[PDB]
Write a protein that binds this DNA or RNA. Sequence first.
RNA 1: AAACUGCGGACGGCUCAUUAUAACAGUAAUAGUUUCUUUGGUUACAAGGAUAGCUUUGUGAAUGAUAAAGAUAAUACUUGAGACAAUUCAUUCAAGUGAGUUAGGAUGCCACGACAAUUGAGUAACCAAUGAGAAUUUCUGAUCUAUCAAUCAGUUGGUAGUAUCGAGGACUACCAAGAUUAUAACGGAUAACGAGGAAUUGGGGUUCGACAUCGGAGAGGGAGCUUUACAGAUGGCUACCACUUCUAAGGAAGGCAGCAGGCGCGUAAAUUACCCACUUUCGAAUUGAAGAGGUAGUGACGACACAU
RNA 2: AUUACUUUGAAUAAAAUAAGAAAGCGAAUAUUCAAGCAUGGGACAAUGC
Lengths: 41, 98, 136, 91, 58, 86
Amino acid sequence: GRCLRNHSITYKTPKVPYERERFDAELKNKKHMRTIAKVML
Amino acid sequence: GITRDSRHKRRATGGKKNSMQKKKKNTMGRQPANTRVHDVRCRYGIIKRRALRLENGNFSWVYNASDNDFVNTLVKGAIIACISSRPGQTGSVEGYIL
Amino acid sequence: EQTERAYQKQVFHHYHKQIGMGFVTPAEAIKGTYIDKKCPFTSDVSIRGRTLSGIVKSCHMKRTIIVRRDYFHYVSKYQRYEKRHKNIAVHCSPAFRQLKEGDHVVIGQCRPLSKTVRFNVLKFTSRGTGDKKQFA
Amino acid sequence: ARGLHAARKMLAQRRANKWADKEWKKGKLVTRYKCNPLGTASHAKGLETKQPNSGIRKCVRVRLLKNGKKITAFVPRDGSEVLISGFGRRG
Amino acid sequence: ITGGCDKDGFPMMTGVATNNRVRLLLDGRNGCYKPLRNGERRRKTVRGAIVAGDISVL
Amino acid sequence: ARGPRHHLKRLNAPHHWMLSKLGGTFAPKPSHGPHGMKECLPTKRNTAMMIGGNGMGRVGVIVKREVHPGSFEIVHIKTFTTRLNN
RNA sequence: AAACUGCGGACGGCUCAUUAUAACAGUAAUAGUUUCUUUGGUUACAAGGAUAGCUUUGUGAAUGAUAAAGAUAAUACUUGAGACAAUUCAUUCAAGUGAGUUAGGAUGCCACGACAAUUGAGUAACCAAUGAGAAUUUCUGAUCUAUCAAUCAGUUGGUAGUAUCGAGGACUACCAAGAUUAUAACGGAUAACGAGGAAUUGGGGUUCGACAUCGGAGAGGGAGCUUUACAGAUGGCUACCACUUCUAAGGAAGGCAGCAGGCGCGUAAAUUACCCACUUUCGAAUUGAAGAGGUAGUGACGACACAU
RNA sequence: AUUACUUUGAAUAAAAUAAGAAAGCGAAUAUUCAAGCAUGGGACAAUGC
């Protein structure tokens, strides 16, 4: 390890870079519990 | 000098061990001062009475089982009576009449 | 037994003790004339925590035999086991005379007795004859 | 083998068959330290086309400081100690 | 004689019975070295107890 | 190590001392005495008291005490189980 | 203040070159060892001398350089009494523990021998704890390789001694022929310190882990030692190999893989800063010290929020 | 009769993982397998009797 202080990522870029059905829907900039529900169901 | 660790011996299969460190003081060995009385500062500060040579001896009521060559070194179990103390460690010869 | 350069003698000279957790001193230990400084029952060597078993692989060594252990090793990726073995040298007192290769022996852990020997035979069970009656 | 106690062979079988892998083997045997001009490094400081395409590719020959081997290097753009870093395809 | 230094500054010993600079694993028991730690021995060089012309002063 | 350790790290300190992970690089080393390093402080962890394992901080009365000559002995308390030393 | 004496510098900090059942992780034992510190308990109205700082002479260029002489103290070094404690040995009586001719008692012997001839708290010997700790050791577990198939002679065991803080071929003398191996021994490679962990994953897995914390090992290379309670110590010594430095040319010291910093190397990595104020440690101790530690500087490695 | 298997426990450094703006600080916080200890069961198995 390198540091005692924790850190996290607050987003994840999509797998497919260019898809029209996503460019329109998403359009300042373009910058969990479902599975938690899943595991108990 | 003399070490007593098993880092230089082989394995039960005959393998040669490979060095990963150097000699450490906790494996100290010492030159056997044959009792044909000094003191040695052992670990933890205790003292060992190293009897270099000695002739008198307490006993209670010609042959060495280990090495015939020793026949006049004084060691435990030697016949002279049979010595029962460790003269090289305790610093005196204590034996019993056969 | 006095076939060596020193007058062999017992450890507590004035003797037979008994081992601990649910064991029985063999008959040959008491009446036997053998002088053994490393015998569990007629000396000052005890049996501490560990306790294993196995079959006897070799009975050629003087007052020592080889116990073979077979077990399994589960391997995560394939969800399967593989046969494995380990051999340990065990000191065996002359209190057991019928003991031969191929028998099943309960052993216990004692203090370091040699470069390899660290255990003592406690209770043995004989098996079928492996065509060679090789004893201690 | 499929039985419950045959974990030795399939573990052994897989180890043998991995060596057939061109990509996997290249990363384990000793050529990335003696045959790769770049070694395991990214960049390296140093000092006519195929049939259906005609023209001339301007190129350069470079002797590396560390190894000393001579390699052919392209020039990036039109009309274009040197740092060289591979191409699109790895190796 | 009670002691003295050599032309190069080295003292003269008392036990030593020569006339040349002799390198000795000295200790504090014979003066010519003052240990910094305890039980520290340095191979210092000194001169024999016999007088000579090299003795810069007696 | 050439000799006995003197310093103590914050992370290596016992859990129940409740020391934070960012307060300081070191933690106070308990001196030798009547209580051990991990059994002292320089249910959140006859009728008895649990000082050891998972039951630490629990009070109650013993029902029975199995004994195994091999390794240890077990105490059952009104019910939870734990070794004698707890 | 200095000096003597006492304590510590064996912790801390850095690095990952070694190392392939070795180290390491978990588990078990020490009825096979054990200090240091701390904590609990037990067991002659004062004697004797010398020594530094002090003063004096000096020496060589100088090291953390050393020589002469004259004094003066001890909780430095001794003797000495107020009166035991534990070691060795031989014999014997013998209750916990799963388990002991065991703790313990008794007999005779040896050894050692006090509770400072201390100061305005200090000390010796032993017992216990601290101690799950240190150290040895039990069981199980590691990457690739057959273009490595047979390997081992202190080798495997037995006796008796030695040596060790202590078990043990750890070692020595005698005796025996034994140990391992296709369930991969022996050997070879690593751009191999191991673990807790990290990256990525539907499940399963693949790759990395020098680097916060735990354990190991090292201080240019071996080796040999000193002091102590703990070192095979290297910001201690000694010798060889290989280097570095000062020199009045006779000689002299040193070990940045501590913090900064310079070179060399390379694709690849920051200030020759301030302070003990946090955390903690060491000390004759509430004060002193700490490139541990904190603060400040550089810092599109990365992460979170957020202008245009 | 052991072993394997299986169920429960004991015992199990922290940090971290997940969990009761990145952060920070008392979670029952559960791990964390390979072994090892104790235990209820004996259907499928292996070892001799």
